């Protein structure tokens, strides 16, 4: 995560987008902060409050990061846009390109207490998109 | 509710008590604010944070106040102390007496957004103990 | 407003962006829903929760929409990106080009009761960016 | 501390009470767990969440327990009830009698990492009321 963002904020930048552009454009936002392009990324087309609601669901083992057990599965599917890197052999981050896979799935988030700089409206916040179902 | 308390605070005074005195003593705290003694009252022997956790459970019809659908059932039982008025024919609130019924039950709370004067730690707070199961 | 968004959501699409791309890219997200490119637009580099907190500030006359008295000024300045259309002849919205004016100002928002489809976490939500100061 | 309470919980039993009865009644809750009546005790008329927020204030030397440097002063005064034992001869704890000193002061608390059984909502919790100012 870039220091310019709290974990919650970085979560929102990577994973919350009511109406993202196509993956090749959407992913620049993320990849500008990275050494190499991200292999895959899902943008949930929902609101941060809806994801916070998932944080109060039953705590589960994180499916993709199994050392953690602060994950939570959504009770409802959300529309989303899944992005897949299709040119991992490529010069600049500026040249990374992605295939677009719009969909609708349940999602699983890891949640933690907020950063002091985060809005007091959400003392518990999503900090990682663990997977989608 | 007395104006000296937010709804959350009044909820805590009526329903959260890690180690209450016997019902006849415990109930004075409540009945001092009332015109007549309360017929029944349950004190949950738990912490306010644990009750807030219940606020994120699935929203249900409130069993005892069926015009509301902002209720939530706990996933776990808590020890508690149930108080039952046994002298409804009686002079002062100061003379009300209660039978004591310690127990362990699931509980159902109605939750709402916090008052501005409530701690920012809990933007969603229990405001009524609807029933126990 | 496009109907697939509540007012609060459309407010967020137009005016909330933690890390917007340059105006000429950022404005496409808005102008795709228009026949004519928007003459100007400010993106606040903050979160929706922060703006909702400004809804709780003193109600004032909206400076740019003076028939309304449901506007609220932020207590603090926020970083933002202001976009100004520089080629209003443009035949196709895809061809609109914007000057970029990064800045840091107080903001004034009109707030209203939430749409039923907005989270119950915010009974009052921002619906229009009235101006910045 | 009695073992059926975490340190945070025992802190709450001794020092957190929105609406305590007079000292001679209130102190029984504490003295039942002792052979000798407590010489003095302050009840803060606030909530545990509020105190936990004071844990995030500047760490200072604890004024009354100077081997420790994990104390934190409140930014604001709170209403409180101070209790002073007035009959230290007392053979039976049930016979201890207290003078009442309602007041309003800043407080200083020692805070530590939570017990595993304390809510994960507060990684740091108050464990001792060090003094009031």
Swiss-Prot record, chains A, B, C, D:
Glycosylation sites: 57, 65, 92
Region annotation (Required for nearly all of the bactericidal activity) ranges: 1-45
GO cellular component annotations of the record: azurophil granule lumen; extracellular region; extracellular space
GO molecular function, one term: nucleic acid binding
Disulfide topology: 23-83, 37-96, 55-111, 62-71
Active site per the UniProt annotation: 15, 128
Enzyme Commission identifier(s): 3.1.27.-
Site residues by UniProt (May be involved in LPS- and LTA-binding): 35
Annotated keywords: Antibiotic, Antimicrobial, Disulfide bond, Endonuclease, Glycoprotein, Hydrolase, Nitration, Nuclease, Secreted, Signal
Top-level taxon in the UniProt lineage: Eukaryota
Localization in the cell: Secreted
Top-level enzyme category: hydrolase
UniProt site (May be involved in LPS-binding): 33
GO biological process, one term: RNA catabolic process
Modified residues (3'-nitrotyrosine): 33
Annotated substrate binding sites: 38-42
Quaternary organization: Interacts with bacterial lipopolysaccharide (LPS) and lipoteichoic acid (LTA). In vitro interacts with and insert into lipid bilayers composed of dioleoyl phosphatidylcholine and dioleoyl phosphatidylglycerol. In vitro, tends to form amyloid-like aggregates at pH 3, but not at pH 5, nor 7.
Family note: Belongs to the pancreatic ribonuclease family.
Stated role: Cytotoxin and helminthotoxin with low-efficiency ribonuclease activity. Possesses a wide variety of biological activities. Exhibits antibacterial activity, including cytoplasmic membrane depolarization of preferentially Gram-negative, but also Gram-positive strains. Promotes E.coli outer membrane detachment, alteration of the overall cell shape and partial loss of cell content.
Protein name, per record: Eosinophil cationic protein
Organism: Homo sapiens (Human)
Span of the entire protein shown here: 28 to 160 of 160
